[PDB]
Amino acid sequence: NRYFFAIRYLSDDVDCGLLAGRCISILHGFRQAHPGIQIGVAFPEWSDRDLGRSIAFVSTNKSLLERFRERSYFQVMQADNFFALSLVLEVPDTCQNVRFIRNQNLAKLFVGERRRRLARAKRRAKARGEAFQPHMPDETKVVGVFHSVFMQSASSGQSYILHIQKHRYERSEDSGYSSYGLASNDLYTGYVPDLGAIFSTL
Amino acid sequence: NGQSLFDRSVFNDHVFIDALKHVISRPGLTRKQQRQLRLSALRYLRRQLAIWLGPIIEWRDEIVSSGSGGLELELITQPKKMLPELMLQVAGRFHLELQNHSAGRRFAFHPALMAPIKSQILWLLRQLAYLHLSGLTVYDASALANPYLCGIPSLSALAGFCHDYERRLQSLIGQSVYFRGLAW
Amino acid sequence: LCTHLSYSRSLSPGKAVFFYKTAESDFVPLRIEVAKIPQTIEACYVPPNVDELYCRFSLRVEANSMRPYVCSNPDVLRVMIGLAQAYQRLGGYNELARRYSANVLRGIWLWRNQYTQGTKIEIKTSLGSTYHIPDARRLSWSGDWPELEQKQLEQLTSEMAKALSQPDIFWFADVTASLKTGFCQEIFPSQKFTESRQLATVECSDGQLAACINPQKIGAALQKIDDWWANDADLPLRVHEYGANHEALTALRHPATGQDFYHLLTKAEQFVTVLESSELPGEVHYLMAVLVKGGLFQKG
Amino acid sequence: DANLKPKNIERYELAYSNPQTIEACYVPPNVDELYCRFSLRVEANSMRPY
Amino acid sequence: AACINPQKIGAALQKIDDWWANDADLPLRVHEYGANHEALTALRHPATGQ
RNA sequence: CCAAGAAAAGGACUGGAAGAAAUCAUCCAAGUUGGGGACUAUUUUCUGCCGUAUAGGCAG
């Protein structure tokens, strides 16, 4: 009921965080052309120390996934021997699922985010008419492990980082993927198979 | 034994010192002259590089072919294909050996000698990358050679053995075969 | 030369601490927040509703370059003594004092935190003086300072010129600066050196932690007054026996040139002779500056 | 080297720092004074050979 | 806690000896041979009879 | 083509009994480890809307 294909990086000096960002950007552009589609992003070479030198895409519609594979960027990168591409094939029925949820809460670890939050809070108080009296939290927080992907803004002058965590799957409800094929903590449920198996194919 | 495997006198040649000076060289001469002096020095030095590591390579070939822990012993025991990657380490040791010598204090780690030394070493590394009867066992040999003497078995018996062996081989090979001497 | 020769340091700060005032108490420390994520992330910024941040440190100056701490050679000692005095009586301490004094009033010891809406520097000393720079953002290495400010540079130069040259004067300065800041402006304290990064703090007597700048980091800024090489002033280097330049990864007084400390140390007999005929040249200014930042000068 | 040949060292090789581990001690912020104390005993013990 | 060693306090208290060379200068730590650490020498070398 | 040529040392077995290492003793006296010092750089983490909110959730 599921199809996938994978891409591996051939060069030993490849920067995974820079390069991975381009594949996501393409997925986004495709999503804009055909709004009613669902394609998920998986990292079959995910590790606790690094992101890994490979990426894979998973979906349910074979004919649509083929169209994605035909996108010119991928074809060029293969021709110049930067990428190794697989063919589209069926997902094995003997595996387990993971989420790949992204966490925007981690933004609050950096000064720039706190500044913006407070500036808005001050201005917001004028409607209430009360004096601006902010109240700060304590000194210690605990967070999980995450990796970064470098991203360019869409039709603007900015760039920023995506922060990716890996959660184990638990089954409930119905699904949907975000514009980046990523999962959200709430109200964006989906999953991908953790295809670290049969990777000897590339 | 915990001792250095390196040559004890490759650096004791006054010509070696001159060779270095020639690589360093001098202006005022024509291209042909400079190249001839330079190349000659390099060829000499090339030989010295082969000599310097000589006993070390000898150790390797002898031991590995025939059948601890120090790098100048273990890194040579490894596969010959790996040897080219030791170039920087060898070149390092080389300068150090010069640094520890009475004459080499004028040359070691001098910028002028860097590429020359490294190139010739790299070349060398890439380059690096009678009937004998052994192991015979005799059971119950006669230890009494003659009625007067016990000890080493009678030599008349070995001469005998050489010949019975020669006759058996001669009946197998059409060509004449003959045994001049025999060692024990 | 000789086997044993040492000088100790003649000029030194203690460390700098960041804090702010409230209506309830005069000293509230600026603190740092840490998340364990070990491998951590951390941040520090001025909190909402604090309009200005304070930074303070103390400085002692001692006339301790007049005599070798240790010397194993009576002839080396006779000369070094004659030289320091030959120099002292022609002036020249004024020049060194002028250079050190200019750096304190300019404020470069704030390193990366100079970018304020207005920085005010106030100095008090053990002899009863007070100095006031209403705005430190406009004073250059080279140029004429505006009136009433040029004057305080002269007055401060005089007190320090004495502190550096006459013994049994116990001279202390107490330097406080005020940083008028932005809405939630980020602050840059000293970092910890490790084998992610961590920041340095100090403990208060009540158990609270505070952000700080290390002693030698304040010191490295003050002594950056070496521009006597190559007849091209540019900006000054931190005094170093080899003229090291960290930004360009090079060295201006490389031993290969004959312009380093050790070549110059051996000509003392000739310099004293010149001073007697005296004009002070760059060669003796360099030497005096190094003796002030004392250290080991041995194994000749 | 023996104030003779200056060593071969390339220019950039001296711009590097030399890290070290040291112990140090400072008075903490806001202490008004520091105290130091010891005791001394004196004996009339030079009158006779031990 | 930080401390100063016993003999380090002691060396200071007994720094009393300006009886050599008929010129008081600064006093030395009492020593059988008149050792002077700052100058790395000795003021009552056996060769002097002092 | 060897002081040459050929060759089964085997079968059986009880070391036992018994014992007191003891009395005495002073390691002491003196002693300076010290001098000097930049963890940040060609960094990737910006810009907003909802929510009483430095909580929690979101688009680009």
Q: What does the DSSP assignment read for C233-251?
A: -SSPBPP-TT-EETTTTEE
Q: Residue C112 CA to nucleotide F43 C1', Å?
A: 14
Please tell me which residue lies nearest to nucleotide F28, judged from CA to C1': D50
By three-state DSSP, how is residue A160 classified? strand
Q: Is A1 exposed, middle or buried (0-12, 13-18, 19+ CB in 10 A)?
A: exposed
Q: How many CB atoms sit inside 10 A of residue C256's CB?
A: 11
Residue C110's alpha-carbon distances to C209, C213, C218, in angstroms, are 20, 9, 8
Nearest nucleotide (CA of C195 to C1'): F39
Do B27 and B37 touch, CB atoms closer than 8 A?
no
Do A103 and A146 touch, CB atoms closer than 8 A?
yes
CA B152, CA C179: separation in Å to the nearest integer? 103
- Quick one: CA dihedral A23, A24, A29, A32, positive or negative? positive
Instruction: Quote the strand ranges of chain C, DSSP E.
Output: 5-6, 11-13, 16-20, 28-29, 33-35, 41-43, 52-61, 70-71, 119-125, 130-133, 171-180, 201-203, 209-213, 244-245, 250-251
CA A151, CA A162: separation in Å to the nearest integer? 7
DSSP-derived letter for residue C3 is S
CA-based nearest residue to B163, from B181, B175, B145, B151: B181
Please tell me which residue lies nearest to nucleotide F41, judged from CA to C1': C247
**Parallel/antiparallel/unpaired status of strands A140-141 and C33-35:** parallel
Q: What Rg do the C-alpha atoms of chain E give, in angstroms? A: 13
| CA-based nearest residue in chain D for residue E10 | D40
Chain A residue numbers touching C38 (CB-CB < 8 A): none
Residue B182's alpha-carbon distances to B146, B163, C51, in angstroms, are 21, 10, 106
CA C111, CA D34: separation in Å to the nearest integer? 32
**How many CB contacts within 8 angstroms connect chain C with chain E?**
7
CA A138, CA A70: separation in Å to the nearest integer? 52
CA-based nearest residue to C177, from C111, C223, C94, C238: C111
Chain E residue numbers touching C71 (CB-CB < 8 A): 39
Chain D residue numbers touching E4 (CB-CB < 8 A): 36
Answer yes or no: is A144 CB < 7 A from strand F: no
Residue C177's alpha-carbon distances to A132, C31, C122, C286, in angstroms, are 29, 19, 6, 31
The DSSP element (H or E) to which A98 belongs, if any, is: strand A97-98
How many residues would you count in chain E?
50
Centroid of chain to Cα C68: 22
Q: Which of C2, C6, C8, C70 best tests the E interface by mutation, with the highest count of E CBs <10 A?
A: C70
CA-based nearest residue to B20, from B125, B95, B74, B81: B95
Residue B43's alpha-carbon distances to A128, B11, B31, B126, in angstroms, are 90, 16, 18, 16
Residue type for A41, please? V
CA B10, CA B20: separation in Å to the nearest integer? 13
> What is the token pair recorded at E17?
């000896």
Helices and strands of chain A, counted as H and E runs? 4, 10
Q: Is B111 on the interface with D (CB under 8 A)?
A: yes
A111, A119, A140 ranked by CB distance to C45: nearest? A111
Q: What technique determined this structure?
A: cryo-EM
Phi, psi of A5 (to 5 degrees): -150, 160
- Which residues neighbour A83 within 8 Å (Cβ) at sequence distance 6 or greater? A7, A8, A9, A10, A74, A77
Each domain of chain C, given as residue ranges in start order, spans 1-9+64-92+224-300, 10-30+44-63+93-190
Centroid of chain to Cα A26: 12
Q: How many CB atoms sit inside 10 A of residue C246's CB?
A: 12
Answer yes or no: is A25 CB < 7 A from strand F: no
Are A and D touching by the rule of 3+ CB pairs within 8 Å? Answer: no
Our CA angle for C125, C128, C132, nearest 5°, is 65
Chain F positions with any atom < 7 A from a protein CB:
1-4, 29, 31-41, 44-49, 51-60
Do D24 and C200 touch, CB atoms closer than 8 A?
no
Are C and D touching by the rule of 3+ CB pairs within 8 Å? Answer: yes
Count Cβ neighbours within 10 Å for each residue of B83-105 and write b for 16 or more, e otherwise: beebbeebbebbbebbeebeebe
Give the resolution value in Å.
3.5
Count Cβ neighbours within 10 Å for each residue of B56-79 and write b for 16 or more, e otherwise: bbeebeeeeeeeeeeebeebbeee
